Amino acid sequence: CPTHADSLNNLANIKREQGNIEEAVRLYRKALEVFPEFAAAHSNLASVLQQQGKLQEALMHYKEAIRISPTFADAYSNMGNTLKEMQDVQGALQCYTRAIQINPAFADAHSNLASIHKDSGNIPEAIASYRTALKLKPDFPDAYCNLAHCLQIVCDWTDYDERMKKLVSIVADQLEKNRLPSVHPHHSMLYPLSHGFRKAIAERHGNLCLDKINVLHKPPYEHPKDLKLSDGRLRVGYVSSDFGNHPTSHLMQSIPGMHNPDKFEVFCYALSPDDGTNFRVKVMAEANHFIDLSQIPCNGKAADRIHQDGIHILVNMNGYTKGARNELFALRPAPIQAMWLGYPGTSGALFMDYIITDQETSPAEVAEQYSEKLAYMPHTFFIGDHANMFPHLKKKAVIDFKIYDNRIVLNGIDLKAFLDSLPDVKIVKMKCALNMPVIPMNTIAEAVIEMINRGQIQITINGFSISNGLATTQINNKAATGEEVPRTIIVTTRSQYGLPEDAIVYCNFNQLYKIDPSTLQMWANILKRVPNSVLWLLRFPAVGEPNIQQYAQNMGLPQNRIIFSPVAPKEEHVRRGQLADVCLDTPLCNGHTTGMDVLWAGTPMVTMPGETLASRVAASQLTCLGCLELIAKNRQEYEDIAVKLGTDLEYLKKVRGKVWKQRISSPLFNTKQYTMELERLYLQMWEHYAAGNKPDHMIK
Numbered sequence: 153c154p155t156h157a158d159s160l161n162n163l164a165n166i167k168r169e170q171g172n173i174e175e176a177v178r179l180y181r182k183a184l185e186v187f188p189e190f191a192a193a194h195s196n197l198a199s200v201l202q203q204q205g206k207l208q209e210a211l212m213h214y215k216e217a218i219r220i221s222p223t224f225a226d227a228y229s230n231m232g233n234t235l236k237e238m239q240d241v242q243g244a245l246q247c248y249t250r251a252i253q254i255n256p257a258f259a260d261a262h263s264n265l266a267s268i269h270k271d272s273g274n275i276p277e278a279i280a281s282y283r284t285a286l287k288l289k290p291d292f293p294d295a296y297c298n299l300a301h302c303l304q305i306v307c308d309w310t311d312y313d314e315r316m317k318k319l320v321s322i323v324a325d326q327l328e329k330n331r332l333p334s335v336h337p338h339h340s341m342l343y344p345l346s347h348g349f350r351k352a353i354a355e356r357h358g359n360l361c362l363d364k365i366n367v368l369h370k371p372p373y374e375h376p377k378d379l380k381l382s383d384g385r386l387r388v389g390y391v392s393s394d395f396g397n398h399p400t401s402h403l404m405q406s407i408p409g410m411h412n413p414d415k416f417e418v419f420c421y422a423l424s425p426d427d428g429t430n431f432r433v434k435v436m437a438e439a440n441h442f443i444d445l446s447q448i449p450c451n452g453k454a455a456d457r458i459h460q461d462g463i464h465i466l467v468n469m470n471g472y473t474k475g476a477r478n479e480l481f482a483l484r485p486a487p488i489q490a491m492w493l494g495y496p497g498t499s500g501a502l503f504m505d506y507i508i509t510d511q512e513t514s515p516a517e518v519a520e521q522y523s524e525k526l527a528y529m530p531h532t533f534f535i536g537d538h539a540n541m542f543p544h545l546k547k548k549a550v551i552d553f554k555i556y557d558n559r560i561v562l563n564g565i566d567l568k569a570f571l572d573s574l575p576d577v578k579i580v581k582m583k584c585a586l587n588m589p590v591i592p593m594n595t596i597a598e599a600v601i602e603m604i605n606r607g608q609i610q611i612t613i614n615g616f617s618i619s620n621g622l623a624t625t626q627i628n629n630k631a632a633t634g635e636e637v638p639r640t641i642i643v644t645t646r647s648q649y650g651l652p653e654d655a656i657v658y659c660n661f662n663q664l665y666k667i668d669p670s671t672l673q674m675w676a677n678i679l680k681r682v683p684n685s686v687l688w689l690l691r692f693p694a695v696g697e698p699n700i701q702q703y704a705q706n707m708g709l710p711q712n713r714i715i716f717s718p719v720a721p722k723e724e725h726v727r728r729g730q731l732a733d734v735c736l737d738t739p740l741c742n743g744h745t746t747g748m749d750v751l752w753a754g755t756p757m758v759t760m761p762g763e764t765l766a767s768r769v770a771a772s773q774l775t776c777l778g779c780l781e782l783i784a785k786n787r788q789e790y791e792d793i794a795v796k797l798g799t800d801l802e803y804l805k806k807v808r809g810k811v812w813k814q815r816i817s818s819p820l821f822n823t824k825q826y827t828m829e830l831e832r833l834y835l836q837m838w839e840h841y842a843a844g845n846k847p848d849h850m851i852k
């Protein structure tokens with residue numbers, strides 16, 4: 153029977169559908185003032201408080217809801233989500249398991265339990281629990297879409313086309329019902345959704361930040377109109393949770409120190425605590441100001457701090473990735489706010505003005521897939537610190553064994569001095585001043601092979617320190633992660649990774665989720681046309697290896713055609729790319745950071761640009777490099793380009809030499825020029841704002 157508080161609860165339910173969140177709270181609270189023992193009112197109020205970010209208070213009402221109704225399995229599940237958001241994964245897990253034990257048919261708890269496993273890398277366990285959730289509730293969009301991503305990570309392509317068809321129909325149905333899509337924005341690049349669908353997904357998720365900041369009830373920030381208080385300097389703020397041992401940091405760590413201190417004042421806002429790595433040290437020691445916002449949990453106070461610094465241009469280096477605090481940008485503490493480098497997609501949000509990209513990555517004809525205005529960098533928006541992090545890979549030498557450049561490679565800072573101690577060093581000349589020292593098969597050469605085959609850590613030849621490529625972490629762990637430059641000479645051989653000493657090696661060091669059935673089929677075609685070639689992949693994760701292999705068998709490839717390797721330390725991973733002949737980029741989602749890694753090794757990369765940002769980054773990197781003949785307009789051209797590289801050995805030599813020279817001469821790895829071009833772009837933005845205009849496209 154309906155009571156008095158029962159009506160108030162129903163009234164607030166309506167307000168929650170209307171979107172009028174704040175009034176729903178008042179009605180939920182008024183209902184609890186009438187009936188303090190109202191379990192449903194407690195659960196509902198807490199569900200709203202959770203949306204508002206008031207987690208501690210939501211947790212309070214969740215416990216009360218359970219004290220009143222001990223069989224409220226739905227209250228357990230929601231309390232877990234709150235605890236999961238409160239970084240108490242321990243307590244969250246307990247809530248889910250308790251819920252399942254009370255009601256084994258409660259599908260939502262099984263789904264939430266699977267999400268915990270998924271976030272913890274336990275993919276097979278996550279898949280198992282998602283299937284249980286779906287077996288209980290067949291119409292479960294959140295579970296289905298999460299399972300879809302789980303199957304993507306491990307390359308489970310069972311009913312792939314049917315699965316893609318349903319994913320789209322789910323997002324479409326949800327967008328037409330005006331509900332939050334079950335597909336995460338960072339995952340939208342993987343599915344055959346429309347451009348409109350993806351931007352809509354980004355928009356819906358952006359609006360989640362609005363709810364969390366509206367409760368603060370903060371007035372609009374008064375923004376600077378000039379550079380007077382800043383002494384004629386533009387104040388640029390870089391907001392990231394990746395200042396440390398993270399891919400983002402690797403690319404841009406040099407950039408803040410290379411800014412012009414006469415025109416710019418750099419502020420780095422860290423969303424993560426100090427991990428002690430050298431990457432964090434460099435940025436802290438080179439940025440004009442370093443602010444640890446990880447010690448400022450409240451978005452209101454954090455945004456206040458940003459505004460109190462007088463930031464003109466605030467930069468979002470996270471977007472929709474792990475550790476992002478987009479509530480900061482939603483509060484708009486800066487007059488100009490831009491997306492940069494970190495997130496390969498649109499934010500879909502009103503509180504984001506520009507997105508720093510380029511002509512190649514984001515051509516003007518597809519600007520309608522972004523919500524922000526386009527802000528073109530001259531060449532490519534992408535950057536890497538490979539010139540600074542791995543200067544020992546700038547020059548190499550090889551060992552002959554009866555001349556190839558990827559069988560037995562030696563790198564080192566004092567490498568040229570080591571070669572001068574050797575009697576019969578051959579100097580092979582590259583074409584388009586460059587050379588490649590070749591060591592003949594003598595006593596010294598055999599001593600090195602001995603170290604490799606035996607599995608020794610290191611040896612000493614003529615006083616020089618000759619190190620094993622597989623033992624970099626046992627000699628200098630700092631050099632292994634890339635925090636330091638190796639102070640010894642490192643030997644890298646194909647035998648170390650089980651690669652055949654006489655075969656064409658196609659490599660792809662990306663995570664396995666980037667591969668779809670059409671890509672493996674595309675690669676199988678290449679491998680079949682090049683009989684003496686192999687495909688080099690990584691166990692990323694390892695459980696994807698039996699899956700990838702299985703489909704390769706069905707396409708007609710013997711097992712020995714694809715060779716897997718474990719994930720290596722950062723330095724080893726970049727360096728061992730020297731062993732490959734050609735890198736086959738993934739068309740569904742390009743290798744972004746990994747793309748810069750293979751290029752620094754001088755390894756040519758074949759790519760096929762898609763329509764999404766993430767599927768066009770590699771091609772943007774290649775145009776900047778100067779290798780337009782490595783870009784394919786369709787699948788057939790992709791396969792053709794690779795097949796030619798694997799059969800025309802003199803053509804392969806010309807292209808490999810082209811990448812080896814233009815990785816230094818082109819502006820691709822030039823962090824100094826990139827910074828200046830970025831600065832030039834910053835000023836165009838500010839002058840546009842200072843003139844009294846609202847953000848518009850920047851095409852130089």
Ligand SMILES: CC(=O)N[C@@H]1[C@@H](O)[C@H](O)[C@@H](CO)S[C@@H]1OP(=O)(O)OP(=O)(O)OC[C@H]1O[C@@H](n2ccc(=O)[nH]c2=O)[C@H](O)[C@@H]1O
Pocket residue numbers: 398399400401402403493494495496661662663690718719720721722723725741742743744745746747749766
């Ligand atoms: C699609 C997408 O999300 N793109 C993002 C870009 O948009 C951002 O601009 C990049 C900067 O944040 S991050 C991201 O870049 P991606 O290119 O997807 O790489 P991802 O995040 O899988 O990890 C590769 C790392 O593992 C290291 N790595 C890899 C293999 C290995 O054996 N050893 C190793 O150290 C590599 O050296 C790298 O350090």
